[PDB]
Amino acid sequence: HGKRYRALLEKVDPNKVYTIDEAARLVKELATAKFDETVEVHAKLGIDPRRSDQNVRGTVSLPHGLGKAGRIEFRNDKTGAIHAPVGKASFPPEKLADNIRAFIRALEAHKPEGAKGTFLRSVYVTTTMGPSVRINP
Amino acid sequence: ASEVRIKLLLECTECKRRNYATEKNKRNTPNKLELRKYCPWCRKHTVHREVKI
Amino acid sequence: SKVCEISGKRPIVANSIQRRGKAKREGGVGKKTTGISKRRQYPNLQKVRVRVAGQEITFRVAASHIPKVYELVERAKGLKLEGLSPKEIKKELLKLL
RNA sequence: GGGGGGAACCUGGGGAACUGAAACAUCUCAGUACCCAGAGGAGAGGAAAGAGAAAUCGACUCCCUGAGUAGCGGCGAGCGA
RNA sequence: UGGUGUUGGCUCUUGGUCGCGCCUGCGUAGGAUAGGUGGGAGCCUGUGAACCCCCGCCUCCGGGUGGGGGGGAGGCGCCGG
RNA sequence: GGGCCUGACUGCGAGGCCUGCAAGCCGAGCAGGGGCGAAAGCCGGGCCUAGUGAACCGGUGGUCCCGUGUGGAAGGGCCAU
RNA sequence: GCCCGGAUAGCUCAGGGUAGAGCAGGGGAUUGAAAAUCCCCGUGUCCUUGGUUCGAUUCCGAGUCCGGGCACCA
Ligand SMILES: [Mg+2]
Ligand SMILES: [Mg+2]
Ligand SMILES: [Mg+2]
Ligand SMILES: [Mg+2]
Ligand SMILES: [Mg+2]
Ligand SMILES: [Mg+2]
Ligand SMILES: [Mg+2]
Ligand SMILES: [Mg+2]
Ligand SMILES: [Mg+2]
Ligand SMILES: [Mg+2]
Ligand SMILES: [Mg+2]
Ligand SMILES: [Mg+2]
Ligand SMILES: [Mg+2]
Ligand SMILES: [Mg+2]
Ligand SMILES: [Mg+2]
Ligand SMILES: [Mg+2]
Ligand SMILES: [Mg+2]
Ligand SMILES: [Mg+2]
Ligand SMILES: [Mg+2]
Ligand SMILES: [Mg+2]
Ligand SMILES: [Mg+2]
Ligand SMILES: [Mg+2]
Ligand SMILES: [Mg+2]
Ligand SMILES: [Mg+2]
Ligand SMILES: [Mg+2]
Ligand SMILES: [Mg+2]
Ligand SMILES: [Mg+2]
Ligand SMILES: [Mg+2]
Ligand SMILES: [Mg+2]
Ligand SMILES: [Mg+2]
Ligand SMILES: [Mg+2]
Ligand SMILES: [Mg+2]
Ligand SMILES: [Mg+2]
Ligand SMILES: [Mg+2]
Ligand SMILES: [Mg+2]
Ligand SMILES: [Mg+2]
Ligand SMILES: [Mg+2]
Ligand SMILES: [Mg+2]
Ligand SMILES: [Mg+2]
Ligand SMILES: [Mg+2]
Ligand SMILES: [Mg+2]
Ligand SMILES: [Mg+2]
Ligand SMILES: [Zn+2]
């Protein structure tokens, strides 16, 4: 890892869970690359990968989002993960939590009807080249 | 009955209540039976589907 | 195996009950008792040897009441015990129970 | 101070079988008979970590009732608050 | 005969599972050892590139990776078949 | 032999055959919702008479009846198998 | 009743990119014979259907059938 990244690592701490708001305040502190990084929200659906019927797929029209308007399409990969762009590192903090939360909502709205586990086994917020923070969905 | 001539229920396809029990021969009739029958529950005829006894 | 010197526990009488079948809870027809018979249940008696006023005293006690013996030795500190035989020391020790 | 005795009665520790189930094993007989330890003119029990539906009662023992009820039961024979 | 009590000290070696770290993935077209999607035009270097000496190794035999001794400014992508 | 079908109905059932009991048997007619037929009408399996097994225990699908102070739940009842 | 499973050519069989191996059959070499040996060749929805992937005997759902296991039987 590069000094630049090693730096950021300090402003994190894995143990801590954080909050949609707490994470939104960090994003900016984590976007140290020469461009408007994104943000991304990585989940980890607690459903069976190799299957169908219980496949999470759809779209969400984020109120602000992207800035690159909304309607992002997301689809769970072969593993139990699902990923999506929630906006660019710019965006005032009180603008991301609105999307993070608006996106996570859609995920729950697309949970199957036959799924074992806590569904959102885990969730994280990040930036294109920065580290990541778990969050209380 | 035998292992091949087997017993079965008919379940009202609308309300899902088993209403009639009958038999069939599963060689001669591998497909699940469909039959219009009177569901006491829905008070009308209703196609019923074979359901494992 | 007999009696706890500390707790008083002695063997009780128990029935050994043989059963068969699948319990109703597991969707079975139920349990049938294919035999009942008396047996005995003994205290887990064990020897405990402790030194007290430089004499060796030894207890037949149920495992459970083992630390009770060490407790009795502790409370024996404030006791005019010296010179006594094992027997009368043990007597004295039990008097504290 | 103990020890030993006492017809029955009493409480504690142990504890059958015939029999009944028109066979028999769970169940019954029965915690009976019997053995043993102890007590006494009685013994046991006894002042709620109780009942159980009454916004209630108020230690324990004994009799009547509740009731062959509620229940228990190879849901059999029977057992039984 | 398993578990467990009575049942303790010190070592050496193992498996399961959880958390973190790191690497492992080779049909065939092909720069050649493509996990899966997703973000994405920059990222690596005085917090030391380019080959080198010992290599922990891994190997599908071409390479993959990795800590260190030398080392003193270029390597790696978008491009694009 | 062909066409359309599922009455191999749900709720009942006057009246009987048979008969120690229990069981077994036949049944017109009314209601519901149907099938076939122009209609009269027929249809509650099969020309008939064997193709079977009481209770008990328990499985499953229903119903929402009971639910040990109360609300639930455990567990039962009822209907079907 | 439930849990684990096998189906791949005539027989027995191993296996995310594929389709083979043993001896049975046939052709040839060799042999006095019978073999053993040696070389070539076949003999496939990889149980069925449905769904992943650019595709699949390979992953998943569902079936059909034999195989195993555990338990229960008023
Ligand atoms: Mg019927
Ligand atoms: Mg039939
Ligand atoms: Mg009804
Ligand atoms: Mg036992
Ligand atoms: Mg029983
Ligand atoms: Mg203990
Ligand atoms: Mg006396
Ligand atoms: Mg006496
Ligand atoms: Mg007694
Ligand atoms: Mg007695
Ligand atoms: Mg005896
Ligand atoms: Mg007897
Ligand atoms: Mg007898
Ligand atoms: Mg008898
Ligand atoms: Mg008799
Ligand atoms: Mg006899
Ligand atoms: Mg008794
Ligand atoms: Mg008196
Ligand atoms: Mg008293
Ligand atoms: Mg008091
Ligand atoms: Mg009884
Ligand atoms: Mg009794
Ligand atoms: Mg043992
Ligand atoms: Mg041990
Ligand atoms: Mg016809
Ligand atoms: Mg009908
Ligand atoms: Mg009559
Ligand atoms: Mg009669
Ligand atoms: Mg008409
Ligand atoms: Mg008419
Ligand atoms: Mg009629
Ligand atoms: Mg019986
Ligand atoms: Mg029953
Ligand atoms: Mg109720
Ligand atoms: Mg109620
Ligand atoms: Mg209660
Ligand atoms: Mg209640
Ligand atoms: Mg409540
Ligand atoms: Mg219930
Ligand atoms: Mg019920
Ligand atoms: Mg099964
Ligand atoms: Mg084969
Ligand atoms: Zn119905």
Swiss-Prot record, chain A:
Is 4Fe-4S set as a keyword in this record? no
Q: Name one GO biological process term.
A: translation
**Secretion signal, residue range per the UniProt entry:** none
Q: Which domain of life is it from?
A: Bacteria
Q: Which UniProt keywords apply?
A: Repressor, Ribonucleoprotein, Ribosomal protein, RNA-binding, rRNA-binding, Translation regulation, tRNA-binding
User: Among its keywords, does the record have Protein biosynthesis?
Assistant: no
**A molecular function (GO) term:** rRNA binding
What are its GO cellular component terms? large ribosomal subunit
Family under the similarity heading? Belongs to the universal ribosomal protein uL1 family.
Q: What does this protein do?
A: Directly binds to 23S rRNA. Forms what is known as the L1 stalk, which protrudes beyond the 70S ribosome surface. The stalk is preferentially stabilized in 70S versus 50S crystals. Interacts with the E site tRNA, blocking the exit path. This blockage implies that this section of the ribosome must be able to move to release the deacetylated tRNA.
Q: Describe its assembly.
A: Part of the 50S ribosomal subunit.
NCBIfam families for this protein: rplA_bact
Q: Which PANTHER family does the entry link to? A: 54S RIBOSOMAL PROTEIN L1, MITOCHONDRIAL, LARGE RIBOSOMAL SUBUNIT PROTEIN UL1M
Question: What is the protein named?
Answer: Large ribosomal subunit protein uL1
Source organism: Thermus thermophilus (strain ATCC 27634 / DSM 579 / HB8)
Swiss-Prot record, chain B:
* Keywords from the named record: Ribonucleoprotein, Ribosomal protein, RNA-binding, rRNA-binding, tRNA-binding
Molecular function per GO: rRNA binding; structural constituent of ribosome; tRNA binding
* InterPro entries, A to Z: Ribosomal_bL33, Ribosomal_bL33_CS, Ribosomal_bL33_sf, Ribosomal_zn-bd
Keyword match Ribosomal protein: yes
Kindly indicate whether the keyword rRNA-binding belongs to this entry: yes
- GO CC terms for this protein? cytoplasm; ribonucleoprotein complex; ribosome
A Pfam family assignment:
Ribosomal_L33
Q: Which GO terms describe its biological process?
A: translation
- How is this protein organized at the quaternary level? Part of the 50S ribosomal subunit.
Q: What does this protein do?
A: Found on the solvent side of the large subunit. Contacts the E site tRNA.
In which family does this protein belong, per the annotation?
Belongs to the bacterial ribosomal protein bL33 family.
Report the protein name in the record. Answer: Large ribosomal subunit protein bL33
UniProtKB/Swiss-Prot annotation, chain C:
The record ties this protein, via SUPFAM superfamilies, to:
L28p-like
Which stretches are transmembrane?
Answer: none
Origin, by domain of life?
Bacteria
For whether the record's keyword set contains Ribosomal protein, the answer is yes
**Where would one find the signal peptide in this protein?**
none
GO molecular function (one):
structural constituent of ribosome
A Pfam short name: Ribosomal_L28
Which InterPro entries does the protein's record reference? Bacterial_rp_bL28 (IPR050096), Ribosomal_bL28 (IPR026569), Ribosomal_bL28/bL31-like_sf (IPR034704), Ribosomal_bL28_bact-type (IPR001383)
Is Iron given among the entry's keywords?
no
Q: Which GO terms describe its cellular component?
A: ribonucleoprotein complex; ribosome
What Gene3D superfamilies does the record tag this protein with? Answer: 2.20.150.30, 3.30.160.850
Q: Name one GO biological process term.
A: translation
Alphabetically list the UniProt keywords: Ribonucleoprotein, Ribosomal protein
Which family does the similarity line name? Belongs to the bacterial ribosomal protein bL28 family.
Q: Quaternary form?
A: Part of the 50S ribosomal subunit.
Question: What name does the UniProt record give this protein?
Answer: Large ribosomal subunit protein bL28
Lineage, uppermost ranks = Bacteria, Thermotogati, Deinococcota, Deinococci, Thermales
Chain's gene name: rpmB
